[PDB]
Amino acid sequence: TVVVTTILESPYVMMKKNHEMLEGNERYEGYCVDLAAEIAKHCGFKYKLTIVGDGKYGARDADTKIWNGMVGELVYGKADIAIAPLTITLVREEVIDFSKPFMSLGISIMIKKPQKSKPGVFSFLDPLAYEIWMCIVFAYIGVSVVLFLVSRFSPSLSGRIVGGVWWFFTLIIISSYTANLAAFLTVERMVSPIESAEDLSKQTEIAYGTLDSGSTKEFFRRSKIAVFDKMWTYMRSAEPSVFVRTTAEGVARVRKSKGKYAYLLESTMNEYIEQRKPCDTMKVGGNLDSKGYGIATPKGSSLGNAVNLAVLKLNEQGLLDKLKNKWWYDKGECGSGTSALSLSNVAGVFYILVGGLGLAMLVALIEFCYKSRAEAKR
Amino acid sequence: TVVVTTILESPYVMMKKNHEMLEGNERYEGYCVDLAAEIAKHCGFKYKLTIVGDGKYGARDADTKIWNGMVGELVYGKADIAIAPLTITLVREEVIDFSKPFMSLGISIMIKKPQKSKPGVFSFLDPLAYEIWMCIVFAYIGVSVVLFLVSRFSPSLSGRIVGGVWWFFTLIIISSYTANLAAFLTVERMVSPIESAEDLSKQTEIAYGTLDSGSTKEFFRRSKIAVFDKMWTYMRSAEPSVFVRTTAEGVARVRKSKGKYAYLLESTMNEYIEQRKPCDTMKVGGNLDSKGYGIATPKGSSLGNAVNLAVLKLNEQGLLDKLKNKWWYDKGECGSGTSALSLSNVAGVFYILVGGLGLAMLVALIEFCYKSRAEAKR
Amino acid sequence: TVVVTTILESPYVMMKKNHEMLEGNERYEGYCVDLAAEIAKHCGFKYKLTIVGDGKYGARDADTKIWNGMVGELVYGKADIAIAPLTITLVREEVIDFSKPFMSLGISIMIKKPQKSKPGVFSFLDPLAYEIWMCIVFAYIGVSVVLFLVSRFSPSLSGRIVGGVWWFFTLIIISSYTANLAAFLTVERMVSPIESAEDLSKQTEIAYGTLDSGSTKEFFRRSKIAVFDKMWTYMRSAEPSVFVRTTAEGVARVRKSKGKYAYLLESTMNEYIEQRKPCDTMKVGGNLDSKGYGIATPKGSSLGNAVNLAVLKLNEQGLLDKLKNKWWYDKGECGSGTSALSLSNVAGVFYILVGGLGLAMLVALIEFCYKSRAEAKR
Amino acid sequence: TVVVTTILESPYVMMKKNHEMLEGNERYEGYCVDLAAEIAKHCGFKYKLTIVGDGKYGARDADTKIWNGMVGELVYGKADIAIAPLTITLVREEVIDFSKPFMSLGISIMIKKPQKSKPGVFSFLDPLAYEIWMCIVFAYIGVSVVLFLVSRFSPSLSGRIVGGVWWFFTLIIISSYTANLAAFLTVERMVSPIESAEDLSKQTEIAYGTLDSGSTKEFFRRSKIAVFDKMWTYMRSAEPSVFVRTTAEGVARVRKSKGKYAYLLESTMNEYIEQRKPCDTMKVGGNLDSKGYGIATPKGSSLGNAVNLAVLKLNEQGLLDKLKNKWWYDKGECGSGTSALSLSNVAGVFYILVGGLGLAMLVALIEFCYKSRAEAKR
Amino acid sequence: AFTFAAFCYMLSLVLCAALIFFAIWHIIAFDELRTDARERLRNIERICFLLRKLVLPEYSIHSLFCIMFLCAQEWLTLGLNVPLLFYHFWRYFHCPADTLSYCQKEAWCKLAFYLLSFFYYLYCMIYTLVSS
Amino acid sequence: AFTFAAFCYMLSLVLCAALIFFAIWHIIAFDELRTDFVHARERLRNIERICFLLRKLVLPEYSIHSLFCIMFLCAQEWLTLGLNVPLLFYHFWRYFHCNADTLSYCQKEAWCKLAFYLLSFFYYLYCMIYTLVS
Amino acid sequence: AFTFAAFCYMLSLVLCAALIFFAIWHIIAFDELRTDFVHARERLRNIERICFLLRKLVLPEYSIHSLFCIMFLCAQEWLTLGLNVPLLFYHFWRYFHCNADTLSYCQKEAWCKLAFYLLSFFYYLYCMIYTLVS
Amino acid sequence: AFTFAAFCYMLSLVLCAALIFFAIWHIIAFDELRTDARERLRNIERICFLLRKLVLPEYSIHSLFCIMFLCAQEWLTLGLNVPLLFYHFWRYFHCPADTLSYCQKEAWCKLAFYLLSFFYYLYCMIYTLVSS
């Protein structure tokens, strides 16, 4: 048989519900399970799905240069093959031989999907533009002036055509405003200003951090590009600590920071959470970097070419995409992903009403204290 | 003889109003009864009816390898012929000679008969909270007050601007109300409840369930179809349980639920139910699968050859459709069971209108008195 | 090998595009093709897909009792098996042995999908009910009366509350009408009063006919039911001749008689056309009768049981539904199946306007000829 | 040394502004050029560039069984190493040693850059025809005329009823206009253009096409995926032809078409195009498949082992991302390339307003003259 | 629950609520005029002015009642109104305007009729409301 | 079958009804003034009243006729508009063209104006009719 | 953070501004009448004018105060409404409770009414404030 | 194409179209009064009435111009209006109302200013329209 070493990470390596009532390869399930099944079908051998001890993927010590993880297993002969979501690198290739990637990915951006924003104190103006509002105001005051002129500058045929045209105007304005507001309320299209990493780079309102110990951190540290260097400078000087100790910690932070944070992680896990509950997440932008998960095998081996060819066979057959849609979307829980009107949407209306009414009262009072005062004193 | 084994399943076979005072074929009554009567009239024989012991149709046990129910009764001489809703299957055709289907059918969907057209008397205020209606009312009366004041103590500019701001305010207000109402109406209008199975596969609000165990879920299993595959995946990951015990359980739980649950069962039973009290159910989705019920008989027999012809003769004469009508609709406790705005949605408006009118008549009468009396007489 | 006799009828028996560049079983394609392929896989034999000569399905002569069609081929040994969309009957069973039906169907109703009706001269009233309109009219005249009373019955506090309540009323009415009209215009839900055959039975505006020579005609002639007998009486006395000579003739007649005709045919072909171009057809109601297509084989044969079992094997496997979705819906072309406002929608408005204006003019003129005449003469 | 065979495909490899006055590696320029430069700096060798004769990558002939292009050049000693967009495949990995992908990519979608935001000056009349606008105008002036007449020759009832009917008329008119405008706006608002491939599989208005022949359609073929299966079915039944000749053909025909056509091609070429004049294209749908380009080399070589390491080193240092940025965006002829109502939708309203106002001023002036002059002076 | 006829009944009810006080004022003016120089002449003329003035409202509102009850399909109620219409028509034909006894008698009878039609409309509306 | 012209024609005939009434009233006024042609004071008051009314019934003619003209101009109807033009030309001619002499011809002028406006009313009716159905 | 009460309070204080102005004008009117208490004819005309104005400034008090009361009643504010009730009770008492004697107490009555309405204005302001933020 | 400032320019243009005729009427009234018993007194008083009356419109419209050009960000145009505003303020402070020479001179200068601001606004609007 073969020593199929891997690690517990979903939806690649999962324990069936009846794991205690089972003992064997039937225990584990997920993506890499079916992957290894297809590989065995192509190569025709027996295997035993083992697991890593240190619960890590693979690396070496800085001082003792000892390989920890599946790398330590394969290099030191403790295993024979590692069908796991292993990341390809220069260091790992220098000691062993990978296969052509079967799943390409890259860093992504997880956030909470845009929820209904604040009622927008001055929202009743959103359906139209400030320019149109000021134009309407000026039209009103100008028509008032004109009507004032046809009373003193002349005793009508002036208040008739003016009345008709003003009726037309106000009619069309009413209709336009109502239609636009109805369209706004009927569909409620939600969007956010974050469609890339450049957006997060320019802005500073919503924060963004990464696991305080991992490959993404090292990458952002490196990559001296005008953009990612800016983000590294930001996160190196940013309070409170945007960094976290585990993934679920960052996910929960995003969930409790609806519009104040955004996490970075492998696009695969991001799409995963995007389909898991409570379905309050979403991936934005595209893969900033480019990486690929590939099989591993010791430097001197025999299956190297076999698996290197089987991976391409599958990728061309249209099977890896099948398994992905199975373990991400078909299994997906969020396959799906009106209200009354509150006062906070129209508060500005009453504010302006009261302001204008108080102004009118003050005007009338000063006019009175002037007119009557002059008529009495003189 | 001629024995005739059947099963007590309504409405195919049922007992007269008084089964204690009956002895013979007259005891039972139902579709299958008239069916057997016509069969005897065709082949010209005397028969005696009987019921199955286990109260089942027929099936094998993985250990006994012995057919139960009427199937076993036939294979083991306990029955000369079977006349009942005996589903046709491959396993059963291997041991007995089914006649051609006297009734074709298939899986169906069931939902609550929608008659929820009871609108609140003051529903027209639903688009926005009373928190805004009271503001509207009090602002109206306050602006009237201020206009009266300005026109009283200064007999204009202030009047002009209060009129303009009131115009702006009422504009925005009626616009908001109309837009929210249009959104509500539109949303309520573009809701296609259901027309087939996929209408449910692409949604998750309305759950759908089946019996705890039966040919239904089996058909859903081992089903290549992507729609039924997704439905089976959903129901298997259902929480709470979509599957339920005996039909009555699903029927009642969907009866109480407004539109949140649906029950997948046989089309024929769904028809029977839809024509039974409290007439609060219906069937819309066309039959998904396609099967049929047939008359069984021992393999080495002479009736089957002489019975298939009778079945086809009755299917051509429409006698079978006639019996189905008789026992589903003519015997139906439910005879046969829009877009505009009804008055009920606006009653409160006319109510308050009449209220204001009567109050105004009262005010005018008391003022006319308080004036004429006090002046002429007093 | 075997003599697989059939007939050219789509989507069951079709000639591939490269039929002239081919010679063999690869020529033909369709539903029955894959059906016979699965049958051969189950039974494991060779066959040659022949075709019928007389281009008919099967029947016998009234005087010479000679079997024409595939029936003549199988009974007279000219063939060995008939995998065709053959209809099961009593006569055919008396000479040969069919198999359990693989496709259940029944007569249906083809029509042209409802197109935008006439602009509805008095359509502006459709959003509401006549009762609400008359209520509004009476409210207007009554408020006018009241206002007339507070001028003579008294010199206000009466025109204030009345003004406010009337403002409220007209506001809400405007909003309701606008919202309902917007909902009507946004979605444009199309429906027709034909959801069954009972509808066509009661009404007589739109006609309905069938091929002047076929099984549907004989059926409608027979079936002495309160409904179908009415329709037969209708069509036997109906001008012009609703009957036709071929299917395509009736389809074209329905296409040129958008709202004046409805055809009857096998539900299979109906669903077929419903997916073909110009996609201007639709099937309504449900299968009035019940029939089934089944394999055929001579009375004394050997494959009888084999195919009788293979048909059920497939029907339980979920394969016939696959082939149907393939040759009807997947192959389907009509996988998919706003405007400005014309004057014809509001003509009644201007009609009523002009009527009322002329009435007002006449009233004013008689009032003048009375008042001035009395003031001059007296 | 070291020969380097490539292919003249932009922007990977291109010629300097003056290729006639150049001799050596300085002749060419592009991504692959700097790539090979870094490769040489890593492995420390001198190289000489060359182009392929057939102008192709590589493939087999069903009769020659002889690889062409750079593949054959390598297998037949005509090339020491290949550095170009050489798609990785199973067939080619069997004859040469591909390095790990220096660039991951996949199939993409292309559409016309939408900037169609030019509204008609008098668009606000679009909701309903001028045939109704002129009726409105003339009815207004006629009703004003009749009111003037009634109030003149009979100094009321007629006035009351004409006011009421005018109220009814204007009510219905504003309601109709507002509702039609709301329908227009809403419809125009709820149009999700595209976000993936399924957005097209479920529609047929916008056609999608590919190259006449290539790996693209081959991927579409032998594709179990239901979405890609349906897309292939559609394109195969496409009339006119969705498939086209060399890329430029599809590009131009989609450029001219507003939104009726889409071109499926490689994501990388789509990016290059989107960053080229006339900047009227974009890419939105995520990559469907997942493949990569790699450095090839003769099987029994030493560079591949020494080249995969360099490739991974550059992929980790981000040098590849930097080169792509340089040659796609920095070298981009296009730098980087809502809901409310803009004034343009209402300009005509203010135009006619100012028109009526100026006309009223003129009328008032001429009346003031014709009165004062004629009375005092004349 | 509403049927659009309850609206007509409510309107007629609110209008008869004023008709009844109008007829009460009529009877009171008659009792005051029962006294039958310049002071009395004016005290009589100022009231006769309002009286002769307030004719039109009755005809208008009765026409309104008849029209609404004709369009609301309340036939059983219209027959109980048409006699007053014919009476008003005969009045307009020839009305006394010796002149006090008949006036007070017609006023009393019309007041009783109005106050009973009040209850008639009220009960008819109450029954139409809960006819569900 | 509306074409925007049926509405215009029916409005025009509605106005022509008031026009016909004004013309008939002028007929009767001139008839009574012919008959007539403190009793002198009463006659003076009556003739003053009738002349005041007539002077108040001047603008309606111009207004309604200019309305007919402009309406049929925007409706693009040249089969009857050209028929209304002459009356407008005469109306503009009256300014520099125009009590025992004035009525001598005014009688026949008003009679012919009555016949003309009545003919135009009937023409507008028939045109609205055979335009509303087509 | 609106609660429908901030709008009511700001409207009430807007009205209380006019109320304060009327009260101050009454202060000054009574002061000038005290000072005063065809020169006699001029004084009679001036006192007639001022009394006419005062009689015209009667309904505003009742209206605005009843409005405050009913508004705070529908707003369900019992922390300041109970404070406005006494003034309404005094206003209704004035009917069966109420020129050298009337002003003797009217001076102090108007002074205390000024202080009262000013206090109520400030209270309404502070309440609108600490109700709009919460 | 519009920018919301073309609207202010159109409004000011339509308003100056009347201001210019107003100033023309001023100059004409001055030329008519140049004659300087009861007939002449009345012929002068009836015109002085309208003249003294038509003061407010100027202030109102100039305030409108200044406000619109302040809110439309047309600063270069407001500076060409503020001097007339200060002039009108000094007039209201002390205005002669010996009294004819200065009146006609100010009238002529104001008319020239209005007729040149006409063209200024017209050209500014024409340029703002086609600045696309």
DSSP state, B295? -
Is D376 part of the contact surface with chain H (CB cutoff 8 Å)?
yes
Chains contacting C (3+ CB pairs below 8 angstroms): A, B, D, E, F
Q: Are A309 and D93 an interchain contact pair (Cβ–Cβ within 8 Å)?
A: yes
D210, D243 Cβ separation under 8 angstroms: yes
What six digits make up the tokens of F122? 């009937």
Tell me whether strands A282-284 and A107-111 are parallel, antiparallel or unpaired: antiparallel
What dihedral angle (degrees, nearest 10) is formed by the CA atoms of A306, A307, A309, A313?
130
Partners of B112 in the beta sheet? B281
Q: D176 CA to chain C: closest CA distance, Å?
A: 7
Residue in this structure with the two tokens 């009354």, named with its chain if needed: A340
Name the nearest CA neighbour of B11 among B303, B275, B339, B363.
Answer: B275
Q: G134 CA to chain B: closest CA distance, Å?
A: 17
Name the nearest CA neighbour of E128 among E74, E81, E67.
Answer: E74
Cβ atoms within 10 A of the Cβ of H52, count?
A: 9
A178, C178 Cβ separation under 8 angstroms: yes
List all residues 6 or more positions away from F115 whose beta carbon is below 8 Å from its beta carbon. Answer: none
Q: G45 CA to chain B: closest CA distance, Å?
A: 19
Is C227 part of the contact surface with chain B (CB cutoff 8 Å)?
no
Handedness of CA C150, C154, C155, C159 (dihedral sign): negative
Q: How far apart are CA F128 and CA C51, in angstroms?
A: 67
C311, C102 Cβ separation under 8 angstroms: yes
Of B318, B353, B356, the CB nearest to C223: B318
Q: Are D139 and F7 an interchain contact pair (Cβ–Cβ within 8 Å)?
A: yes
What six digits make up the tokens of C282? 């639709």
On the 0-12 / 13-18 / 19+ scale of CB atoms within 10 A, A203 is: exposed
Is A316 part of the contact surface with chain H (CB cutoff 8 Å)?
no
| Cβ-based contacts of D356 with chain A (< 8 Å) | 161-162, 164-165
Q: How far apart are CA F37 and CA F31, in angstroms?
A: 10
Name the nearest CA neighbour of F14 among C349, C357, D164.
Answer: C357
| Cβ-based contacts of H57 with chain A (< 8 Å) | 148-149, 152-153
B50, B4 Cβ separation under 8 angstroms: yes
Q: Which residue of D has its CA nearest to A133?
A: D343
Phi, psi of C282 (to 5 degrees): -165, 145
Q: Which residue of H has its CA nearest to A134?
A: H4
D189, A187 Cβ separation under 8 angstroms: yes
Q: Are H14 and D361 an interchain contact pair (Cβ–Cβ within 8 Å)?
A: yes
Partners of C82 in the beta sheet? C296
On the 0-12 / 13-18 / 19+ scale of CB atoms within 10 A, D179 is: buried
Q: How far apart are CA D304 and CA D311, in angstroms?
A: 10
Q: Which residue of G has its CA nearest to A373?
A: G25
Interface size, chain C vs chain D, as Cβ–Cβ contacts under 8 Å: 120
H6, H128 Cβ separation under 8 angstroms: yes
Helical pair C161-187 and B130-153, crossing angle rounded to 10 deg: 140
Chains contacting F (3+ CB pairs below 8 angstroms): C, D
Type of residue at A148: F
Distance separating the N- and C-terminal Cα atoms of chain E: 6
Distances (CA, A) of E8 to B353, C130, C158, C173, C289: 12, 15, 21, 18, 53
Over its C-alpha atoms, chain E yields an Rg (Å, rounded) of: 17
Partners of A252 in the beta sheet? none
Q: How far apart are CA A194 and CA A207, in angstroms?
A: 12
Q: How far apart are CA D65 and CA B61, in angstroms?
A: 60
Q: How far apart are CA B188 and CA B116, in angstroms?
A: 13
| Cβ-based contacts of D344 with chain H (< 8 Å) | 1-2
CATH 3.40.190.10 is right for the domain spanning B3-104+291-330: yes
C315, B88 Cβ separation under 8 angstroms: no
Cβ atoms within 10 A of the Cβ of E111, count?
A: 18
Q: How far apart are CA D232 and CA A203, in angstroms?
A: 44
Partners of C48 in the beta sheet? C3
Give, for B350, the enclosing helix (H) or strand (E). Answer: helix B347-372
What six digits make up the tokens of E45? 């003329």
B and D in touch (3+ CB pairs within 8 angstroms): yes
G119, G20 Cβ separation under 8 angstroms: no
CATH for C108-115+192-284? Answer: 3.40.190.10
Partners of B279 in the beta sheet? none
Distances (CA, A) of E109 to A15, C344, E23, E76, E122: 96, 54, 10, 21, 20
B346, C170 Cβ separation under 8 angstroms: no
Q: Are C312 and B90 an interchain contact pair (Cβ–Cβ within 8 Å)?
A: yes
CATH 3.40.640.10 is right for the domain spanning C3-104+292-330: no
Of B159, B204, B233, the CB nearest to A330: B233
Residue window 100-139, chain A: list those with CB within 8 Å of chain B.
124
| Cβ-based contacts of A171 with chain C (< 8 Å) | none
Is H10 part of the contact surface with chain D (CB cutoff 8 Å)?
yes
Of D160, D182, D204, the CB nearest to C335: D204
Name the nearest CA neighbour of A177 among A140, A125, A120, A131.
Answer: A125
- Would the annotation count D92 as a binding residue? yes
Q: How far apart are CA H70 and CA H67, in angstroms?
A: 5
Q: Which residue of A has its CA nearest to B159?
A: A360
What six digits make up the tokens of A368? 């009175």
- Would the annotation count D344 as a binding residue? no
Type of residue at D120: G
Name the 3-class secondary structure at C208. coil
Name the nearest CA neighbour of H29 among H10, H16, H45, H18.
Answer: H45
What six digits make up the tokens of C82? 């008939």
G and H in touch (3+ CB pairs within 8 angstroms): no
Q: How far apart are CA D346 and CA H7, in angstroms?
A: 12
Angle (CA) E27 E32 E34, round 5°:
95
B196, C325 Cβ separation under 8 angstroms: no
Is E68 part of the contact surface with chain C (CB cutoff 8 Å)?
yes
Name the nearest CA neighbour of B34 among B11, B51, B57.
Answer: B11
Residue in this structure with the two tokens 């000063």, named with its chain if needed: A366
Chains contacting E (3+ CB pairs below 8 angstroms): B, C
| Cβ-based contacts of H72 with chain A (< 8 Å) | 134
DSSP state, C103? E
Is A184 part of the contact surface with chain D (CB cutoff 8 Å)?
yes
| Cβ-based contacts of H8 with chain A (< 8 Å) | 138
Which class would CATH give B109-114+193-282? alpha beta
Q: Which residue of D has its CA nearest to A93?
A: D309
D175, C174 Cβ separation under 8 angstroms: yes
Q: Are A135 and H57 an interchain contact pair (Cβ–Cβ within 8 Å)?
A: no
CB half-sphere exposure, D321, CA atoms < 13 A: 20
Is C344 part of the contact surface with chain D (CB cutoff 8 Å)?
no
Q: Are H4 and A149 an interchain contact pair (Cβ–Cβ within 8 Å)?
A: no
Q: How far apart are CA H122 and CA H15, in angstroms?
A: 12
Phi, psi of B214 (to 5 degrees): 180, 180
Q: Are C140 and D204 an interchain contact pair (Cβ–Cβ within 8 Å)?
A: no
Q: D315 CA to chain A: closest CA distance, Å?
A: 8
Of D138, D146, D153, the CB nearest to F71: D138
Q: How far apart are CA C183 and CA C178, in angstroms?
A: 9
Which of E11, E21, E22, E24 is the best residue to mutate to test the C interface, defined by the most C CB atoms within 10 Å of its own CB?
E11
| Cβ-based contacts of H18 with chain D (< 8 Å) | 361, 365
B147, B162 Cβ separation under 8 angstroms: yes
In the annotated binding site of A, the residues are 85, 87, 92, 215-216, 266
Q: Are A153 and H71 an interchain contact pair (Cβ–Cβ within 8 Å)?
A: no
| Cβ-based contacts of G21 with chain A (< 8 Å) | 365
Q: Which residue of H has its CA nearest to D360?
A: H14
Domain boundaries, chain B: 3-104+291-330, 109-114+193-282, 117-192, 346-378
Which class would CATH give A3-105+291-330? alpha beta
D291, D88 Cβ separation under 8 angstroms: yes
List all residues 6 or more positions away from D194 whose beta carbon is below 8 Å from its beta carbon. Answer: D109, D111, D200, D206, D262, D284, D285
Which class would CATH give A108-113+192-284? alpha beta
Domain boundaries, chain E: 1-132
Q: How far apart are CA B225 and CA B243, in angstroms?
A: 20
Name the nearest CA neighbour of F68 among F59, F58, F77.
Answer: F77
Name the nearest CA neighbour of F12 among D139, B219, C286, B325.
Answer: D139
Q: How far apart are CA B97 and CA B295, in angstroms?
A: 8
Say if D3-104+292-330 and D109-114+193-282 have the same CATH topology: yes
Helical segments of chain H, H only: 5-33, 38-53, 55-71, 75-78, 82-93, 101-129
Q: How far apart are CA H69 and CA H65, in angstroms?
A: 6
Q: How far apart are CA G125 and CA G129, in angstroms?
A: 6
Q: H12 CA to chain A: closest CA distance, Å?
A: 10
| Cβ-based contacts of C376 with chain F (< 8 Å) | 46, 49
B17, B90 Cβ separation under 8 angstroms: no
Count of residues for chain G? 134
Q: Which residue of A has its CA nearest to C175?
A: A178
Q: Are A346 and B132 an interchain contact pair (Cβ–Cβ within 8 Å)?
A: yes
Name the nearest CA neighbour of D293 among D87, D9, D99.
Answer: D87
Type of residue at B77: G
Q: How far apart are CA D106 and CA D197, in angstroms?
A: 13
Chains contacting G (3+ CB pairs below 8 angstroms): A, B
Angle (CA) B100 B101 B103, round 5°:
160
Type of residue at A285: G
Of E3, E53, E68, the CB nearest to C152: E53
